[PDB]
Amino acid sequence: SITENTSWNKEFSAEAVNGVFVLCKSSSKSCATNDLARASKEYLPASTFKIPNAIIGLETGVIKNEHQVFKWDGKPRAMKQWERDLTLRGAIQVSAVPVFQQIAREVGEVRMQKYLKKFSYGNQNISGGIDKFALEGQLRISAVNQVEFLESLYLNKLSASKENQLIVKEALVTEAAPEYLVHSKTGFSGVGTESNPGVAWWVGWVEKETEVYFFAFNMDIDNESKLPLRKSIPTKIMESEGII
Amino acid sequence: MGSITENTSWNKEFSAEAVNGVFVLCKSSSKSCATNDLARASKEYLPASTFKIPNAIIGLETGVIKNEHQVFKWDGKPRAMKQWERDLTLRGAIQVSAVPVFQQIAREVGEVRMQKYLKKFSYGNQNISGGIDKFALEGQLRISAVNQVEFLESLYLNKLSASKENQLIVKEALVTEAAPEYLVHSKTGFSGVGTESNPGVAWWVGWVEKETEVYFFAFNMDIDNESKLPLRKSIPTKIMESEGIIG
Fold first, then answer.
1. How far are the Cα atoms of A85, A95, B78, B93 from residue A179, in angstroms, in the given order?
2. A69: which chain B residues are within 8 Å (Cβ-Cβ)?
3. Binding positions for a beta-lactam (chain B)?
4. Nearest chain B alpha carbon to A175
5. What's the CATH fold of domain A1-244?
6. Which of A197, B96, B140, B230 has the fewest other C-beta atoms within 10 Å?
7. Residue A169: closest CA among chain B residues belongs to which residue?
8. Which of A82, A163, A202, A244 is best to mutate for the B interface (most B CBs within 10 A)?
């Protein structure tokens, strides 16, 4: 059950943004959204794929454990901030593409398909290159499926050890306050091409009091200056609803 | 740990607020600790709420706490603070230091099993006498700054005699600050304003993960006035800020 909420629209309006926010209190059994259609429209996950990729890397032994260090070989990487040794949480927090590319290479095409099926992750389309299917390939997922996936992670209900789900959940903490706790991940496919904008994501969940709220946001983007909106629009919404 | 050295430079932060206290700061990779006060670093004090860490571990291990989604229901009988008069999750009771909630866990764990796990954990003097619901706030259990950092290091490394899963559950409960460059796990303690000439004790213990490095810390200080409480965080914060660890 997905119910439309019109009282969030001003936040999209005021910024000239074409996007969707999906928010579910307690569970995915009833979610609210500004856009029914777009709530279930499927986009490239970009770095939001680091969540399932991380779980898969741990499950298959490719990530040896919680304290694994991803050593930099000194070879040039696309961002200076990726040019250093990284923990799992460090690599997730700065979206070190090349670290997770190498994890996917070692997981390999057969095992990757296996887990995306168990995880019911989007269209499960990993075709066209093991190291880029989530960035520029054919894998697609929706705000709704993102929320369903994150809830399973929250409840340890994914087909993976409790231990590995706990390990990944700690790597996803992005805000801690006495009153609430935020787990979240960003994604950004790029600026897109001729009349085909990229997509930007912010997905996660917020624990406040004895309550839980799972959220997923996406938006079309053709200009990187617009990227802070991926967090400020939904943050606005969750501030007014009284979640954070 | 592997070594300790006394670094009296940090005294600046203490003298400022005229605090009698100790900060212990350990670097994981090099296995070395630094402190302003070697003597006080080994002195043993009431854990107070810092004991909520092992108690949480024990509580989950014994099954007294079902899992991490367990809610500790507030009945309705008055409690010592308004904060504690509500339903809390494990992280909630930890973050607000809800004494009654952990008192209840302690009783359900019981003395034999509590004695056993603290033996396993090498937690301070291991004296749980003076009740079973106050042995850490006003009883006989005492722990040193050095012992805290070793304990906390074992937790981080999942090396405590409890399931890795249970240690992960507690560890997530201890997150108090998250930044893209560093993560702080920590817990406070406060035994009370104490008596005449013998003041109470305030704690701040935890660790910081920054880059591929990890920093285990333990702070305590003498305290006779609740107004001074916030110094339990601001002194070590400034030490670790000036060490370049946080900020």
1. 33, 27, 21, 12
2. 212
3. 97, 188, 190, 232
4. B178
5. Beta-lactamase (3.40.710)
6. B230
7. B172
8. A163
CB contact under 8 A, A90 and B212: yes
Positions of A marked catalytic: 47
* B97 marked ligand binding residue: yes
* Amino acid identity for residue A174 in this structure: T
Q: What is the distance in angstroms between the Cα of A30 and the nearest Cα belonging to chain B?
A: 20
Interchain CB distance below 8 Å, A166 and B175: no
How close B127 comes to chain A (CA, Å)?
31
Distance CA B157, CA A92 (A): 20
Q: Three-class SS string for A16-84?
A: CCCEEEEEEECCCCCEEECCHHHHCCEECCHHHHHHHHHHHHHHCCCCCCCCCEECCCCCCCCCHHHCC
Sequence-ordered alpha helix ranges (H) in chain A: 9-13, 36-39, 50-59, 88-93, 97-118, 143-155, 162-170, 229-240
**B98: its two tokens:** 């809800």
| Residue count (chain B) | 247
Q: List C-alpha distances in Å: B121 to A68, B113, B150, B236, B243.
A: 25, 12, 10, 25, 30
Task: Return the DSSP state at A128.
Answer: S
| Structural contact between residues A20 and A38, judged by C-beta atoms closer than 8 angstroms | yes
Residues written for chain A: 244
Experiment used for this model: X-ray
**Residue given tokens 């024990």 in the structure block:** B58
Chain A's closest residue to B72, CA to CA, is A210
User: What fold characterizes domain B1-247?
Assistant: Beta-lactamase (3.40.710)
CB A99, CB A150: distance < 8 Å = no
Chain B residues whose beta carbon lies within 8 Å of the beta carbon of residue A175:
178
CA of B197 vs chain A CAs: smallest distance (Å): 34
d(CA A175, CA A186): 13
Angle between helices A162-170 and A50-59 (to 10 degrees): 140
Write out the two tokens for A107. Answer: 């997981």
Amino acid symbol at B4: I
- Structure letter (DSSP) for residue A158: S
Resolution at which this structure was determined, Å: 2.0
Q: Are A185 and A173 in contact (CB under 8 A)?
A: no
Q: Which chain A residues are closer than 8 Å to B181 by Cβ?
A: 93
- Rounded Cα distance, A106 and B182, in Å: 28
Judged on CB neighbours under 10 Å (0-12, 13-18, 19+), A167 is buried
Which two tokens mark B36?
A: 């302003």
B113 is an annotated ligand-binding site residue: no
Count residue pairs from A and B with Cβ separation < 8 A.
59
d(CA A57, CA A102): 10
Residues 6+ apart with CB under 8 A from B112: none
> Position A152: which residue type?
S
